[PDB]
CSV table of C-alpha atoms and ligand atoms in Angstrom, one decimal:
chain,number,residue,atom,x,y,z
H,1,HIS,CA,1.2,20.3,2.1
H,2,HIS,CA,-1.7,20.1,3.8
H,3,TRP,CA,-3.6,17.3,3.1
H,4,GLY,CA,-4.5,14.4,5.9
H,5,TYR,CA,-6.5,12.4,7.6
H,6,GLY,CA,-8.8,14.8,10.0
H,7,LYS,CA,-12.5,15.8,9.2
H,8,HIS,CA,-10.9,19.3,7.8
H,9,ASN,CA,-8.6,18.1,5.5
H,10,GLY,CA,-9.5,14.4,4.6
H,11,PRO,CA,-10.0,12.4,2.0
H,12,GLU,CA,-13.5,13.8,1.3
H,13,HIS,CA,-12.3,17.5,0.8
H,14,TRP,CA,-8.7,15.9,-1.6
H,15,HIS,CA,-10.5,17.0,-4.8
H,16,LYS,CA,-10.8,20.7,-4.5
H,17,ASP,CA,-6.5,20.2,-4.9
H,18,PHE,CA,-6.7,16.7,-6.7
H,19,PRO,CA,-9.7,16.9,-8.9
H,20,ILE,CA,-8.3,13.6,-10.2
H,21,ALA,CA,-9.6,12.5,-7.1
H,22,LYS,CA,-12.8,12.5,-9.1
H,23,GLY,CA,-11.6,10.9,-11.5
H,24,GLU,CA,-12.9,7.5,-13.9
H,25,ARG,CA,-9.7,4.9,-12.0
H,26,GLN,CA,-9.3,6.0,-8.4
H,27,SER,CA,-8.5,3.4,-5.3
H,28,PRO,CA,-9.2,1.5,-3.3
H,29,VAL,CA,-11.9,0.6,-4.1
H,30,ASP,CA,-14.6,-2.7,-3.0
H,31,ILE,CA,-13.7,-6.2,-4.1
H,32,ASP,CA,-17.4,-7.5,-4.3
H,33,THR,CA,-15.9,-11.8,-4.1
H,34,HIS,CA,-18.7,-12.7,-6.1
H,35,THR,CA,-18.3,-10.7,-9.7
H,36,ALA,CA,-14.3,-10.5,-9.7
H,37,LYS,CA,-14.6,-12.9,-12.3
H,38,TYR,CA,-12.3,-15.9,-13.2
H,39,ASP,CA,-9.3,-15.0,-15.3
H,40,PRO,CA,-7.4,-18.2,-16.8
H,41,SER,CA,-5.1,-15.8,-18.8
H,42,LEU,CA,-3.7,-14.4,-15.1
H,43,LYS,CA,-0.4,-15.2,-14.8
H,44,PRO,CA,1.9,-16.9,-11.7
H,45,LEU,CA,2.9,-13.5,-10.3
H,46,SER,CA,6.5,-13.6,-10.1
H,47,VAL,CA,7.5,-12.3,-6.8
H,48,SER,CA,11.0,-11.6,-6.8
H,49,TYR,CA,12.6,-10.9,-3.5
H,50,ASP,CA,15.3,-12.2,-3.3
H,51,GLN,CA,18.4,-9.4,-3.3
H,52,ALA,CA,16.0,-7.0,-1.6
H,53,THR,CA,18.3,-4.0,-0.1
H,54,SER,CA,16.5,-2.4,2.2
H,55,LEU,CA,17.7,0.9,2.9
H,56,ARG,CA,16.2,3.1,5.3
H,57,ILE,CA,13.1,3.8,8.1
H,58,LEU,CA,10.8,7.1,6.9
H,59,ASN,CA,7.9,8.8,9.1
H,60,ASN,CA,5.7,10.8,6.6
H,61,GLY,CA,3.7,12.6,8.5
H,62,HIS,CA,0.7,10.2,7.0
H,63,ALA,CA,2.5,6.5,7.1
H,64,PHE,CA,6.2,5.1,7.6
H,65,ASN,CA,7.9,4.3,4.6
H,66,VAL,CA,10.6,1.3,4.1
H,67,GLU,CA,12.8,1.7,1.1
H,68,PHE,CA,14.6,0.5,-0.5
H,69,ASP,CA,18.1,0.5,-2.8
H,70,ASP,CA,15.4,0.1,-6.6
H,71,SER,CA,19.4,1.9,-8.2
H,72,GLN,CA,19.1,-1.4,-10.7
H,73,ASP,CA,16.6,-4.8,-10.6
H,74,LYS,CA,17.3,-5.9,-7.7
H,75,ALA,CA,13.4,-6.9,-5.8
H,76,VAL,CA,10.7,-7.1,-8.5
H,77,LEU,CA,7.5,-7.8,-9.8
H,78,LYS,CA,6.1,-9.6,-12.5
H,79,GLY,CA,4.1,-11.4,-14.1
H,80,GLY,CA,0.0,-11.9,-13.3
H,81,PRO,CA,-1.1,-8.9,-15.0
H,82,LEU,CA,1.9,-7.5,-15.7
H,83,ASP,CA,3.6,-6.8,-19.4
H,84,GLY,CA,8.1,-6.0,-18.2
H,85,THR,CA,9.9,-5.6,-15.0
H,86,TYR,CA,8.2,-3.5,-11.8
H,87,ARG,CA,11.1,-2.4,-9.3
H,88,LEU,CA,10.4,-2.5,-5.6
H,89,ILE,CA,11.7,1.4,-4.1
H,90,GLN,CA,9.3,0.7,-1.7
H,91,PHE,CA,6.7,-0.1,1.3
H,92,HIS,CA,4.3,1.5,4.0
H,93,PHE,CA,0.8,0.7,5.6
H,94,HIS,CA,-2.9,1.9,6.2
H,95,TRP,CA,-4.4,0.8,9.4
H,96,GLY,CA,-7.5,1.4,11.7
H,97,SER,CA,-7.4,3.2,15.3
H,98,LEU,CA,-9.3,0.2,16.1
H,99,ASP,CA,-9.0,-3.4,14.1
H,100,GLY,CA,-12.4,-3.6,12.5
H,101,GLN,CA,-11.3,-0.9,10.2
H,102,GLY,CA,-7.9,-0.3,8.1
H,103,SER,CA,-7.3,-1.2,5.3
H,104,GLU,CA,-7.9,0.7,2.2
H,105,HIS,CA,-9.7,-1.6,-0.6
H,106,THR,CA,-11.9,-4.0,1.0
H,107,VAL,CA,-13.7,-7.5,0.5
H,108,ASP,CA,-17.8,-8.2,0.7
H,109,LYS,CA,-17.3,-4.6,2.3
H,110,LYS,CA,-15.2,-6.5,4.5
H,111,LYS,CA,-12.2,-3.9,6.5
H,112,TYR,CA,-9.2,-5.5,7.4
H,113,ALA,CA,-7.2,-4.3,10.4
H,114,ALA,CA,-4.7,-2.7,7.7
H,115,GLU,CA,-3.2,-2.7,4.9
H,116,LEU,CA,0.7,-3.1,2.9
H,117,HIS,CA,1.5,-1.5,0.1
H,118,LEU,CA,4.7,-3.2,-2.0
H,119,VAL,CA,5.2,-0.4,-4.6
H,120,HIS,CA,6.9,-0.9,-7.6
H,121,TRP,CA,7.7,0.7,-10.3
H,122,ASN,CA,7.8,0.2,-14.9
H,123,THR,CA,11.6,-0.5,-15.0
H,124,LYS,CA,10.8,0.3,-19.1
H,125,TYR,CA,10.3,4.5,-18.2
H,126,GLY,CA,13.6,4.9,-16.2
H,127,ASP,CA,12.7,6.7,-13.2
H,128,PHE,CA,9.2,6.6,-10.7
H,129,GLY,CA,8.8,10.4,-11.4
H,130,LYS,CA,8.8,9.4,-15.2
H,131,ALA,CA,6.3,6.1,-14.4
H,132,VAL,CA,3.8,7.9,-11.9
H,133,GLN,CA,2.8,10.3,-15.3
H,134,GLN,CA,1.4,6.8,-17.7
H,135,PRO,CA,-1.4,4.8,-16.8
H,136,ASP,CA,1.6,1.1,-16.1
H,137,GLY,CA,3.6,2.6,-14.7
H,138,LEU,CA,3.1,0.7,-11.1
H,139,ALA,CA,2.0,-1.8,-9.3
H,140,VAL,CA,1.3,-2.2,-6.2
H,141,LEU,CA,1.2,-5.3,-4.3
H,142,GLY,CA,-1.1,-4.9,-2.1
H,143,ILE,CA,-1.8,-7.3,1.8
H,144,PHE,CA,-3.9,-7.9,3.9
H,145,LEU,CA,-3.6,-7.7,7.6
H,146,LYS,CA,-6.0,-8.9,9.9
H,147,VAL,CA,-5.5,-9.2,14.0
H,148,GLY,CA,-5.0,-12.5,15.6
H,149,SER,CA,-1.4,-14.3,15.9
H,150,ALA,CA,1.7,-12.0,15.4
H,151,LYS,CA,3.7,-12.3,12.5
H,152,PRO,CA,7.9,-12.7,12.8
H,153,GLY,CA,8.5,-10.8,10.0
H,154,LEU,CA,6.9,-7.9,10.6
H,155,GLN,CA,8.4,-7.7,14.3
H,156,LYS,CA,12.0,-5.3,13.3
H,157,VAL,CA,9.6,-3.3,12.2
H,158,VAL,CA,7.7,-2.2,14.8
H,159,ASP,CA,10.5,-2.6,17.1
H,160,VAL,CA,12.1,0.6,15.3
H,161,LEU,CA,8.8,2.6,15.4
H,162,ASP,CA,9.5,4.4,18.9
H,163,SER,CA,13.1,6.0,16.5
H,164,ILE,CA,10.9,7.5,14.1
H,165,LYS,CA,8.2,9.2,15.7
H,166,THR,CA,6.6,12.2,14.3
H,167,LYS,CA,7.1,13.8,10.7
H,168,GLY,CA,10.3,13.9,9.6
H,169,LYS,CA,12.0,11.7,11.5
H,170,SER,CA,13.7,8.3,9.7
H,171,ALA,CA,16.1,5.6,10.5
H,172,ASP,CA,19.1,3.7,9.2
H,173,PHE,CA,16.6,0.3,8.3
H,174,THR,CA,19.1,-2.3,6.8
H,175,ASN,CA,19.1,-5.9,6.0
H,176,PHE,CA,15.1,-6.6,5.7
H,177,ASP,CA,13.5,-8.3,4.2
H,178,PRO,CA,10.4,-8.6,2.8
H,179,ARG,CA,9.4,-12.1,2.0
H,180,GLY,CA,9.1,-12.1,6.0
H,181,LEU,CA,5.3,-9.9,5.0
H,182,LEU,CA,3.9,-12.3,2.3
H,183,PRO,CA,1.5,-15.0,3.0
H,184,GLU,CA,1.5,-18.9,1.9
H,185,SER,CA,-1.3,-18.1,-0.9
H,186,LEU,CA,-0.2,-15.7,-4.3
H,187,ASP,CA,-4.1,-16.1,-5.4
H,188,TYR,CA,-5.6,-12.1,-6.0
H,189,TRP,CA,-7.9,-10.0,-7.7
H,190,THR,CA,-6.4,-7.0,-9.8
H,191,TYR,CA,-7.9,-4.0,-11.7
H,192,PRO,CA,-6.9,-0.6,-13.4
H,193,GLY,CA,-6.3,2.0,-10.5
H,194,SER,CA,-4.9,5.1,-9.1
H,195,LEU,CA,-2.1,6.5,-6.0
H,196,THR,CA,-4.7,6.9,-3.3
H,197,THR,CA,-2.8,9.3,-1.5
H,198,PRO,CA,-2.1,13.1,-2.9
H,199,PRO,CA,-1.5,13.1,-5.8
H,200,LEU,CA,-3.9,10.3,-6.8
H,201,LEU,CA,-2.2,9.4,-10.5
H,202,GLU,CA,-4.4,6.9,-12.7
H,203,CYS,CA,-1.0,4.7,-13.2
H,204,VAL,CA,-1.4,1.8,-11.2
H,205,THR,CA,-2.2,-1.4,-11.4
H,206,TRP,CA,-3.6,-3.5,-8.2
H,207,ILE,CA,-2.8,-6.6,-7.1
H,208,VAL,CA,-4.5,-7.3,-4.5
H,209,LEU,CA,-4.3,-10.8,-2.3
H,210,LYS,CA,-7.1,-12.7,-1.0
H,211,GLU,CA,-5.0,-14.2,1.5
H,212,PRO,CA,-4.4,-12.4,5.0
H,213,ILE,CA,-1.3,-12.2,6.3
H,214,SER,CA,-2.2,-12.5,10.6
H,215,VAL,CA,0.2,-10.0,12.9
H,216,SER,CA,-0.6,-9.4,17.5
H,217,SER,CA,-2.9,-7.1,18.6
H,218,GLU,CA,0.1,-5.3,20.4
H,219,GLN,CA,1.8,-4.7,16.7
H,220,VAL,CA,-0.5,-2.9,15.6
H,221,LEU,CA,-1.0,-1.5,18.8
H,222,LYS,CA,3.0,-0.1,18.6
H,223,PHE,CA,1.6,1.9,14.6
H,224,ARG,CA,-1.4,3.1,16.0
H,225,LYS,CA,1.7,5.2,18.6
H,226,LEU,CA,2.4,6.9,16.1
H,227,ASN,CA,2.0,10.5,15.4
H,228,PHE,CA,1.3,12.5,12.5
H,229,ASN,CA,2.8,15.5,14.0
H,230,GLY,CA,6.1,17.0,14.2
H,231,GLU,CA,8.1,17.2,16.9
H,232,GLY,CA,7.2,19.3,19.3
H,233,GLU,CA,3.2,20.1,17.9
H,234,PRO,CA,0.2,18.6,19.1
H,235,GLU,CA,0.0,14.9,19.1
H,236,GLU,CA,-2.1,13.6,17.0
H,237,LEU,CA,-1.8,9.6,16.7
H,238,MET,CA,-1.3,7.9,13.1
H,239,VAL,CA,-4.5,6.0,13.6
H,240,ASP,CA,-7.1,5.9,10.8
H,241,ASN,CA,-4.6,7.3,7.3
H,242,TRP,CA,-6.9,5.0,4.6
H,243,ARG,CA,-8.5,6.6,2.0
H,244,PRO,CA,-11.9,5.1,2.2
H,245,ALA,CA,-13.9,2.8,-1.3
H,246,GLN,CA,-14.2,5.0,-4.4
H,247,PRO,CA,-16.1,3.9,-7.5
H,248,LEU,CA,-15.7,1.3,-9.0
H,249,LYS,CA,-17.0,3.1,-12.9
H,250,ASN,CA,-16.5,1.1,-15.8
H,251,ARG,CA,-13.8,-1.7,-14.4
H,252,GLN,CA,-13.7,-4.9,-14.3
H,253,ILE,CA,-11.7,-6.9,-11.1
H,254,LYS,CA,-10.0,-10.2,-12.8
H,255,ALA,CA,-9.6,-13.3,-10.3
H,256,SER,CA,-6.4,-15.5,-10.1
H,257,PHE,CA,-8.2,-18.1,-9.2
H,258,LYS,CA,-11.5,-20.2,-9.3
L,1,RZ5,C1,6.7,11.8,-7.9
L,1,RZ5,C2,4.6,11.3,-7.6
L,1,RZ5,C3,4.6,11.5,-5.8
L,1,RZ5,C4,4.0,10.3,-5.5
L,1,RZ5,C5,4.3,10.2,-4.6
L,1,RZ5,N1,3.3,9.2,-4.0
L,1,RZ5,C6,3.8,7.6,-3.9
L,1,RZ5,O1,4.7,7.8,-4.2
L,1,RZ5,C7,2.8,7.1,-3.9
L,1,RZ5,C8,3.2,5.1,-3.7
L,1,RZ5,C9,2.3,4.4,-3.6
L,1,RZ5,C10,0.3,5.2,-2.7
L,1,RZ5,S1,-0.1,3.7,-2.8
L,1,RZ5,N2,-1.1,4.2,-1.1
L,1,RZ5,O2,-1.4,3.9,-4.0
L,1,RZ5,O3,0.5,2.5,-2.7
L,1,RZ5,C11,0.8,6.1,-2.9
L,1,RZ5,C12,1.1,7.5,-2.7
L,2,ZN,ZN1,-1.2,3.0,-0.2
C-alpha cells in the first residue's frame, strides 16, 4: 500500500514512505567471510520445533507465509546470540527470476537462488506487535537455498502453491514440520539488523546459517509461478522479491564457528 518489487515501487523507492530504509542497522547485508570474526563466547543455537503447530499458508502479495500457532511456547528459538525465548510465528522465502539471484543476504557477494526466513518474537514483550518496537524484539533464522537435489521437506509447501496463486488467497496448512527445511549444520553468522520489507523496523537479531539447503529446479520453478497480483488482475509473476544488500555501517558480523 503501495510498496513492492517493481521499477516504480521497489527497494530504491521505499525510503520515501519508510525513512528508516536509510538507517544505521538495515538488512540484509553482505557477509564477508574473511571479516566476520569467530566469537568463542557464542552458544550453539537451540532450535526447538518438535511441538510446532502450522496453521495456514497465505499469499500476501509480496511472498507466501506459512503461519504457526504462537499463542503459547510451542516452536521456539533460544541460545546462540539470544537471551530469552523467541516463538516461531511464520516462515517465508525470497527468490529470484533465475537461479543466480534471489537471496537477500549474500556471502562474499555470492547470491543464492532463494532465502528462507523463520521469524520468531521475544516472548518477554508479550505479543508480536510490541516485539517489533524493540531492538531485541525479533530473531530471524535465515537459510540459503541452492538449486540441486530436491528438498523432500519442502515438497508439501510447493504442492499447495497452486491453491494460493494470487494475493489474498490462503489455504489450510496444518501439521507441516519446519524441521524438514533445516540443513545438517547449525553453524551461523549473527549481526543486529532489521525487517527486510516495509516497515523495515530495526528490531531483528539476524542468525544466518552457513550451510545452504538444496532444492530442485522444479521446486523453485513452482515458487516462480505465484503472482504478486490479486485474482483477475494482470499477471505479474512473483519473482525477485528480495531486497539488495544494505550498508553495514557500524556493525560487526560474528561467526559461531572457527
Ligand atoms: C506489526 C508490524 C507489521 C510488520 C509486518 N512485517 C513482518 O512481520 C516481517 C517479518 C519478517 C521479515 S524478514 N523478511 O525480515 O524476515 C519482514 C517483515
Ligand atoms: Zn524475509
